[PDB]
A paper describes a structure:
As a sirtuin (SIR2) family protein, defense-associated sirtuin2 ([name]) has been demonstrated to participate in bacterial anti-phage resistance via depleting nicotinamide adenine dinucleotide (NAD+) of infected cells, which can be activated by tail tube protein (TTP) and inhibited by DSR anti-defense 1 (DSAD1) of diverse phages. To defend phage invasion, Bacillus subtilis utilizes [name] proteins to sense and recognize phage SPR tail tube protein (TTP), then unleashes [name] activity of its SIR2 domain to deplete the cell of NAD+ and abort phage propagation during infection. Each [name] protomer contains three domains, an N-terminal SIR2 domain (SIR2, residues 1 to 297), a middle connector domain (MID, residues 297 to 627), and a C-terminal sensor domain (CTD, residues 627 to 1005). Structural analyses and biochemical studies reveal that [name] forms a tetramer with a SIR2 central core and two distinct conformations.
The cryo-EM structures of [name] from B. subtilis 29R were determined in its apo form at 2.92 Å and its complexed form with TTP and DSAD1 at 3.16 Å and 2.98 Å, respectively. The final models contain only partial tetramer including two complete protomers DSR2A and DSR2B, and two SIR2 domains of DSR2C-SIR2 and DSR2D-SIR2 due to its instability. In the structure, four N-terminal SIR2 domains form a central core consisting of two SIR2 dimers via a head-to-head arrangement with a buried interface area of ~1700 Å2. The complete protomer DSR2A and DSR2B form a scissors-like dimer with a total buried area of ~4000 Å2. Further conformational comparison indicates substantial difference between DSR2A/open and DSR2B/closed with a root mean square deviation (RMSD) of 2.800 Å. Besides the abovementioned identifiable α42, another obvious difference exists in the loop (α30-α31 loop, residues 633 to 643) of CTD with a ~9-Å displacement between two protomers when superimposed. In addition, the small triangular protruding module of SIR2 domain has a conformational change with a rotation of ~20° and a translation of ~7 Å. The result indicates that [name] lacks the capacity to catalyze NAD+ hydrolysis alone, suggesting a potential self-inhibitory property of apo [name]. In addition, the active site suggests that residues N133 and H171 are crucial for [name] [name] activity. In vitro [name] assays further confirm both mutants of N133A and [name] aborting the [name] activity, which is consistent with the result of previously reported phage infection analyses.
Residue numbers in the entry:
A (entry chain B), C (entry chain A): 22 to 297
B (entry chain C): 12 to 335
Write the structure that this text describes.
Amino acid sequence: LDNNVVECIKEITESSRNGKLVFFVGAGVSTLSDYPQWWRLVDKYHEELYGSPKKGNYSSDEYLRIPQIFYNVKGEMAFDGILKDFFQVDKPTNPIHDKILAMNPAHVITTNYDNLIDTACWKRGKYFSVISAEEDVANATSSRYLLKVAGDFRKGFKGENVVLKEDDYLNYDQNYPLISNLMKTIIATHTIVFIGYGLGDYNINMLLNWVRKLQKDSFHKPFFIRTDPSPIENETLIYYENKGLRIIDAASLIDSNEYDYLERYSAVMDLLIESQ
Amino acid sequence: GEKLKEVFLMLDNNVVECIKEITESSRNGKLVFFVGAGVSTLSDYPQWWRLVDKYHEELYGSPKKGNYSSDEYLRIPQIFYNVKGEMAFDGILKDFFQVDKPTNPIHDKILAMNPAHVITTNYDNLIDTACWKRGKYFSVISAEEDVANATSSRYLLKVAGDFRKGFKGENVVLKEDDYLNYDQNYPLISNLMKTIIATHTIVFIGYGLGDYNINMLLNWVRKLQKDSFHKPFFIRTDPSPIENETLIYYENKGLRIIDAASLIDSNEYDYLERYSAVMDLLIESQENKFITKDDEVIDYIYGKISPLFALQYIRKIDLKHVFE
Amino acid sequence: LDNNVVECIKEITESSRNGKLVFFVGAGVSTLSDYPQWWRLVDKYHEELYGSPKKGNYSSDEYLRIPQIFYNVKGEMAFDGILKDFFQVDKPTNPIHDKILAMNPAHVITTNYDNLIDTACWKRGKYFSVISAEEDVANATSSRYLLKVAGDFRKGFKGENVVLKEDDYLNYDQNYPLISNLMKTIIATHTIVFIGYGLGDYNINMLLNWVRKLQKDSFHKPFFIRTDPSPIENETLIYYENKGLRIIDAASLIDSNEYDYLERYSAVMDLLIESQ
């Protein structure tokens, strides 16, 4: 019924019983809680600086520079008020945030700047530690960790706390030294399962650049959950298998429509859950 | 024809202070052009999207159905190299880049702007043929070994490799492995590029303000301290005019932009009209045709003769060298 | 007893009772156990390198290049045999190893390549996970780590395993990627107390550089135990209270002559043990 992923599940359920499994939760999970996807905000910086909305599919150059262009031109207070008006919203808890916590993970690292996984923790009662700035690594009060590597809005709705702009991705190891370093230790020691990302995200490939610098057979290979609608090519699967990743695709396990994300995330995860 | 003189009177104070400083550096011998893919495509040279249409179809069976995402567009020649080998990667490069295409009139206008060096990200041979037609020799540098074995101290610095040592893919940086190992594989091409920018006047031709080369060069400029470096010039040849908020953002990053859609009115596909309206506006400002003020003829004769007040007498056979 | 040494102890005991105290075992605790110091080894090369022994003193260049020349000229089997001739020893444990385990450390990180802290933990029953090479970072069996950051001779008495040559010290971020990460992850989440270095040791200068990359007040400032004969001057003390090394100086607490090393080490540790 399945091809070569039957060995992939058995290590995960072994990692679930051992308590050595860490999910790398992404925005593909958080977009399921009808949270504002980031392209809506870029349009708000677009339509205030250009004086008109985007007429079509804009260029990838101005996909990382319109958050920065509004930062350098319109200032800091105007950039901060828009982060209030688009992020001070209440979204409910997705089933996936129960399904991710159904496996009882070792740590939860995420690039999500919301509080949605920070809501399903205390609702289910699993006590984690929210580290999102540099002042929380040394004042960490628990061996279990919730690591928000892109910052969050706990200290307020300002631009100083969260990684959005272009400068915050380049000047990143020179700004978050212990959150970059705490992440690479977690990936070294515990088994990483990606969920909620494509095979072309900024945060996914920057890991695979690091994995090649490591020694061969020194790392346990990361798993990837692909929930894209179109199925992966046979040459694309071998390109990330020969770069560290072990892809578990949803488009080859179940048959769904082109807009059926929540049905795709559950079918992989319940296959992981029901084995345990 | 005479449109350029009535363009010139419609320039604002920003572009006039760009043309006065680009042309003062060509006269000093401190002008360097940084040539991109824009002047190569005006000679019909095979663009890199015509290659990435070959790989995705010899690696995925069928031609493309939809637009390339930036995730896919960067990584298709690496999937072809890893899966389908290294002799077939060099075969596709051999199939498309055996052309012997002509040099566009823009290759003539760059060299007629009398440069000291020409840096290029183009792996073509088009700029190197045009330099040898004229009576100046450029030491072509495309590998690591060519820097210490340099000859003439006027470099044609091909920072993206070249196919002079064969049609092999290990001599030209094209893939993504070649984009992240560039500082490791090319330590001396990078240092020689960054020293010319630090010591000369730079004009960028053939780019569009979002490029991997312009962005990795404005990151190096962010590391330099304030007011120690001359700001590079950037010629923009795009159909849409530049918006004012973008020209603020790139002037604070250290680019002095001359928009070509802001100087002339042209069609969306007439790229030689936009390239020649900025290059001819520099070339005809040096070959002094935009002097119709009758007190700009005073500080032109003064700027060439006020040195000669330190001497007592000057021969008249020497004054025909003062005025070139 | 001044308040500064008092305020050093009142944290370290509270870190030991909370299980967040990590000792950094250094070259001091092995020479008290009379393990062969490295300078007689660089003598042994310099008896076959230049052909004649040390008529005078050495230079800091020859302190760092005499091993490398022998491995290049005499070969690879001649270098490993000299390490074989001097390291087939069974030296006993000092009491200073026992004063380190007496505070119940959360981790023990050392740059010593001997098995002396291995045997000191085996006798007292403190089971740890020795990580010396890079195939042990992912294959670790526990969460209490015994991290040899300089390698160990468990695989063999060969020059490949242990960083001794000049090429071995410059390619440390390229031969030990994870251990260079696993060390700094422990420094941020614990209280680090150094034992067994001078102020100008090469391993201490590298840790003082990484703290400069860190932020202001984002880290708990580690503690240094300096056991030199002459007491440190108060001017030198202020220079390390901002670079990131609180100093408990052993010479300013008791009286001892110019060669009683084990007296100076035993004094400062009993102030820690009797406080708990």
